[PDB]
Amino acid sequence: EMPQPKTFGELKNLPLLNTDKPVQALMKIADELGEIFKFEAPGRVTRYLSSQRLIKEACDESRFDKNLSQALKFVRDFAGDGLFTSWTHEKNWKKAHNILLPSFSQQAMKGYHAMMVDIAVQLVQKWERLNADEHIEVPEDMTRLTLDTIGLCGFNYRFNSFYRDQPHPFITSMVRALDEAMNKLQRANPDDPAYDENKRQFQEDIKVMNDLVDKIIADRKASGEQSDDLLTHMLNGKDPETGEPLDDENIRYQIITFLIAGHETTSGLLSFALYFLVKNPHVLQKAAEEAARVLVDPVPSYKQVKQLKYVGMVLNEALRLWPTAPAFSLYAKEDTVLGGEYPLEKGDELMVLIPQLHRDKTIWGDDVEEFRPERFENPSAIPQHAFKPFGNGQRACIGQQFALHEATLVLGMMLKHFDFEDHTNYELDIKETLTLKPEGFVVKAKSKKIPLGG
Numbered sequence: 487e488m489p490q491p492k493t494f495g496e497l498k499n500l501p502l503l504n505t506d507k508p509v510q511a512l513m514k515i516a517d518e519l520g521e522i523f524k525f526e527a528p529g530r531v532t533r534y535l536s537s538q539r540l541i542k543e544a545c546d547e548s549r550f551d552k553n554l555s556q557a558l559k560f561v562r563d564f565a566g567d568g569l570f571t572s573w574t575h576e577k578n579w580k581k582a583h584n585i586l587l588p589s590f591s592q593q594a595m596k597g598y599h600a601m602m603v604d605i606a607v608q609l610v611q612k613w614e615r616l617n618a619d620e621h622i623e624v625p626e627d628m629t630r631l632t633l634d635t636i637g638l639c640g641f642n643y644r645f646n647s648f649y650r651d652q653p654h655p656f657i658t659s660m661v662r663a664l665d666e667a668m669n670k671l672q673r674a675n676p677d678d679p680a681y682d683e684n685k686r687q688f689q690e691d692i693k694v695m696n697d698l699v700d701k702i703i704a705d706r707k708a709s710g711e712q713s714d715d716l717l718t719h720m721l722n723g724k725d726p727e728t729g730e731p732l733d734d735e736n737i738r739y740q741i742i743t744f745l746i747a748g749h750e751t752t753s754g755l756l757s758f759a760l761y762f763l764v765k766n767p768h769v770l771q772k773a774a775e776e777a778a779r780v781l782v783d784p785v786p787s788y789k790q791v792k793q794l795k796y797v798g799m800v801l802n803e804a805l806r807l808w809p810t811a812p813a814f815s816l817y818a819k820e821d822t823v824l825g826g827e828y829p830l831e832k833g834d835e836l837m838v839l840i841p842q843l844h845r846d847k848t849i850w851g852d853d854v855e856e857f858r859p860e861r862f863e864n865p866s867a868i869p870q871h872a873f874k875p876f877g878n879g880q881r882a883c884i885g886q887q888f889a890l891h892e893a894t895l896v897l898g899m900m901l902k903h904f905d906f907e908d909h910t911n912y913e914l915d916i917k918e919t920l921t922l923k924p925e926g927f928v929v930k931a932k933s934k935k936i937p938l939g940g
């Protein structure tokens with residue numbers, strides 16, 4: 487049979503998720519139980535997969551499709567039928583996928599590059615302007631950068647995060663809505679009066695988000711201004727298959743979806759990469775040498791960013807150890823046998839535990855906990871389905887090239903401009919929300935005093 491972790495009577499395994507750090511908890515469970523285990527809650531069952539052997543089968547699109555976990559279902563209250571929270575079989579999934587894919591291609595990154603540089607220069611200037619006795623709050627600043635980059639490149643909206651101590655009200659509401667959504671994953675009687683306040687606040691937070699986004703869309707339609715950004719493409723684009731464009735409601739859901747993605751999910755990659763670099767100074771030296779050799783102009787060009795090969799290896803190795811969207815869910819399309827040993831019925835759910843997959847010793851060797859960017863020196867020597875930080879197949883991350891372009895640009899500029907000090911000898915503490923973050927990660931940066939382009 488299938489291993490299963492400890493139970494809590496009629497609550498089955500559900501209380502195991504009643505913790506601050508559920509993914510880390512599930513990883514320990516996988517260390518104990520192996521490549522597959524059953525996880526039961528009242529009314530539901532899912533099987534957690536950790537091995538490349540089984541995950542490669544799960545990633546066969548003829549046999550399994552993307553499932554929406556209860557978490558994703560609660561988030562759908564504000565992300566709607568945007569790309570991330572739609573079923574593959576919903577008309578609006580393929581329609582938006584077809585309309586938006588060209589806006590996310592490697593070719594599209596050339597068009598976003600200048601505005602990415604705009605926000606990256608704001609980060610570099612902030613750090614240049616700190617006084618000698620000060621320090622950097624890494625995740626907080628990386629989030630300023632990533633949120634502002636998606637707002638600007640995406641929809642020509644400036645959140646102006648570097649002008650703020652307290653988040654923009656939209657972000658306050660987005661974060662609190664996401665927290666509420668995932669808090670509901672632990673409530674016996676959702677309709678209890680105790681939760682009346684939570685509900686009022688949730689609706690207020692949804693309205694904050696909708697009002698801003700709907701205004702952004704309406705203002706653009708009225709001006710007729712042809713930016714050339716995601717919003718332009720969504721307003722103008724037609725799905726080649728149906729011949730139809732997106733409606734304004736779905737465009738709003740896509741914008742909210744991109745803003746969530748571009749927040750701590752993408753800034754976590756930068757924060758973990760810097761964490762590993764400061765903990766591995768020889769690797770930081772290699773990466774800084776590439777940045778200084780490649781980034782020879784006052785600001786980076788698109789071409790130069792594509793030449794930061796070792797920087798991209800550092801980012802992939804950070805995604806290997808701490809993928810910031812650490813789990814995705816699948817369902818069986820039909821009755822099928824997994825791995826020649828586990829019979830599944832149509833509808834049965836699977837979870838892919840990505841940090842565990844990325845520690846499969848039969849793929850990576852014994853040293854899986856070492857931070858060694860050289861594992862990605864030839865990124866096509868990596869076996870199929872061994873490395874999945876951006877999900878699978880047609881339901882993989884549409885933002886992968888965007889996230890990697892901004893992370894590579896930013897991290898390159900950081901390494902060119904500053905030497906870094908782990909002045910507190912920071913102890914890794916990974917906070918979990920929808921994403922992963924090295925909470926309390928701080929450094930000091932000493933400027934190399936290299937001028938920036940204006």
Ligand code: HEM
Binds near residue numbers: 743747882886889
């Ligand atoms: C390091 C950064 C990122 C990582 C590791 C990541 C990871 C992932 C993963 C695992 C999925 C599959 C989700 C699932 O199966 O439930 C996904 C999907 C998606 N991501 Fe990303 N993501 C990142 C950044 C971004 C960014 C910056 C954007 C937008 C600007 C974005 C937009 C999306 C969208 C829209 C989907 C759903 C696409 C579809 O199903 O059609 N992501 N991402």
Ligand SMILES: CC(C)C[C@H](NC(=O)CCCCCCCCCCCn1ccnc1)C(=O)O
Binds near residue numbers: 921
């Ligand atoms: C197996 C789980 C116990 C893992 C845990 N997830 C949740 O509690 C459920 C929370 C997931 C819901 C997130 C919904 C947000 C939808 C928008 C995502 C945008 N995005 C991200 C990546 N690319 C796009 C965790 O991640 O710590």
